[PDB]
Amino acid sequence: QYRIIDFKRDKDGIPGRVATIEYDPNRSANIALINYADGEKRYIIAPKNLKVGMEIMSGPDADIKIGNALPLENIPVGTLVHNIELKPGRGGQLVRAAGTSAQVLGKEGKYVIVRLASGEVRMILGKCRATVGEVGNGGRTDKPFVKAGNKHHKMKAPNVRGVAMNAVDHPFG
Amino acid sequence: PITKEEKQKVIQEFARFPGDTGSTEVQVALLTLRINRLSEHLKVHKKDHHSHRGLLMMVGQRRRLLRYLQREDPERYRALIEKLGIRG
RNA sequence: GUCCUAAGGUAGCGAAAUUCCUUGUCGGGUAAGUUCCGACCUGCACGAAAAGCGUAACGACCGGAGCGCUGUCUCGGCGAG
RNA sequence: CCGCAGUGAACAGGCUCUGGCGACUGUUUACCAAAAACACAGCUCUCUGCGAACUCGUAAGAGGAGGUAUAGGGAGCGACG
RNA sequence: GCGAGCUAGCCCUGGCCAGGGUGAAGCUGGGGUGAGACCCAGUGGAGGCCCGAACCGGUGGGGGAUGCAAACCCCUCGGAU
RNA sequence: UUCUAG
RNA sequence: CCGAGGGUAGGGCCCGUGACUGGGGCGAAGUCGUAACAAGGUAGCUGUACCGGAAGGUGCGGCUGGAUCACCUCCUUU
RNA sequence: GUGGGAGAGGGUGGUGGAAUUCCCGGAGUAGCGGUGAAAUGCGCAGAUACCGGGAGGAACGCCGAUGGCGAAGGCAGCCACCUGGUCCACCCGUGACGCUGAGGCGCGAAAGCGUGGGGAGCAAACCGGAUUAGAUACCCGGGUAGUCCACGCCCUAAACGAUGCGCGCUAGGUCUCUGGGUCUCCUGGGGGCCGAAGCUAACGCGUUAAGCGCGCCGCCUGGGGAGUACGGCCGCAAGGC
RNA sequence: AGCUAGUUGGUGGGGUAAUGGCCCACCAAGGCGACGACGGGUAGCCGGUCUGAGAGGAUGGCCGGCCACAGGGGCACUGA
Helix, strand or coil: CCCCCCCCCCCCCCCCECCCCCCCCCCCCCCCECECCCCCCCECCCCCCCCCCCCCCECCCCCCCCCCEEECCCCCCCCCECCCCCCCCCCCCCCCCCCCCECCCCEECEEEEEEECCCEEEECCCCCEECECCCCCCCCCCCCCCCCCHHHHCCCCCCCCCCCCCCCCCCCC | CCCHHHHHHHHHHHCCCCCCCCCHHHHHHHHHHHHHCCHHHHHCCCCCHHHHHHHHHHHHHHHHHHHHHHHHCHHHHHHHHHHHCCCC
């Protein structure tokens, strides 16, 4: 419903309980309200799995318990993640419903290796974080916009195209 | 899997006479029990087509034993079906 | 059998709205049909990606034909405002 | 039972047979042209790891996007087969 | 320097689509097999879906051409959650 | 590599 | 009212039938090539897939209705 | 029933080296690689060979076998999870509960298709090099779809033992595996070989019958056209019945 | 590979020598089919005949039985 919310933990020792299935319409991410100890909440990432009955978190400590997330430092090798913590705390550093996250495919000193979900590879840094678990996007792909144009229903630009025009109009155009 | 003492509590359950180690009452009870944790196994493990075919033989083994008791005494056949719960 | 080129048109299609020689030649439709529609295909100059052959439904799109019906027409002739 | 007539007057599809293009509802050149023109759902190459890449901007800055490679921009075609 | 009370857009915020028709997901029940596939019947009510007012339009013909008018009147037509 | 029929 | 027959329309079963065109069989014999039986010369046949004037070829699978000792590993036994 | 036993039957997850090709560093030359001999090709921007590191699929050597399982196709590095079939001994339990099977219903090579990953290597197509008369093929150097997996679709074949299933009757010698026994051998299953009777037109089958007898099944009945045309069912199609 | 509206049965009833959905009313819906229904192709059926070692093949004109048609298509009369 035209809004944002959470995206980056950094208060821990906190109790992570899988709020609920609030599959969400606004970023290809499907998240559920994450119930913290105090009671303070957050429509959190959609890293598939972690059943309703919440039951997680993270921590400077550990707990690969699927989903959840800590610094690079605190992370296995051969592991699949998201909550792409690029720079030191820059919260998320990639993978948006981009299921196929990154896989600490080898780390090095204040530098941890990452399979570039998108489609390449290089390294991050020290404390830098990132929570494993999948994504959530049920292949958020495909699906037919049949005899109409989902598009429009887009609210998402018919910013339509052209290319053939009659003129000689717009940038590199 | 099927436990050995589970098998006996089933044989004891269905026996009309103390010592019924093998009879219509036991066969069907065995085969039906073997049918419900083999089919349960095939729902996950979708493609176990070798053990599915070996099940179906056993499916046909049941029916023919069932056939016999209706052929002779359909009175205890109605008692054997309801108790187990097969046919629909 | 060759001379040149970077190789030198392939599958589908074809007188198509790319074929001026042309109302091309054969077929059907007709009392005759240079429009159609089928088929040949020497494609004046189709062709796969500004796609190529086809394709149910779909079109105030374009073109071809049959029944129905009327002054559209065989000249109309009367009338009402 | 009656008149030539019995939706009685009044508002109310002509249908069919075929072909070509574009699939389709569309949208558009206000005062000629609504179309085989764009649009498309859909495909393919493809620049881009963020403080993105391209667009405005004299330097800020906004946009992008509080998006983050099932994504954002560049594109030639434009179901499906 | 002057302008979106022209028009093309885009942001924000309200209002508006008389009637009718077609009958997909589903859920209820019944249906030969292990469960099912899956069938049928009921319910059910989607779709830039159909038939049509207002409303949006302005092909196809009629008038008008010092007009009623610097685009309008007439018959006609498309769209119609 | 090829060299008809009776 | 039922109905022989007549009419317009709608479909179904079939015979004829056509420019043209796919193939199939004859026929003295024609051209171009070697596919096949001796490893037919690359052993052949096959399901299939692509490609090649044409026989065919190459690939994935396989069957031998494949066979020699012209070579290796050894096997099996007094 | 019970009590053992074997196995590459299956399907889910998981881990293990061996090498293969590409990538970063070391070292270190002038050639490699390749055939019937060459050539195309790589390489002085330093290749081939060796050292070390990496990443990645894909198979899975020896054991492994003329051996094993399985309804048919077909199935092999170790791991555990569900699970099928099938075999000796006790002779306990039911009590003829059976044997064949139109259609169906399910499986089911490999090619292929549908979408979604992945692609180290192999490899039609296509590309060069050779070749000959000619080279659209053999031979050499490249390389794409596929080959890989999930999921759904095809179901075809020298699908072979070219030979339906069941039971029961008719010498043997011998090799091997599995299960039991008084385990110099007897026993029940299973696999290879020779061989009496017998069948055979021919080879050859020969208690693993192509012998002798009983059920029930499918298929035959001249060669090409044909396994094709046409009607029908099925697939996205290539096709398929 | 599906077939069916007088179609399957029933109540009453017309008509007939009288049974019968035979024709009609009203009622409920079943009746059929691979033990080949619906459809298509073709047809006089038999005693007998020809052939055959036979079982079985063919065939059934004149003599005989039952049946059909009277150019094609129907209907009623008189009437045992």
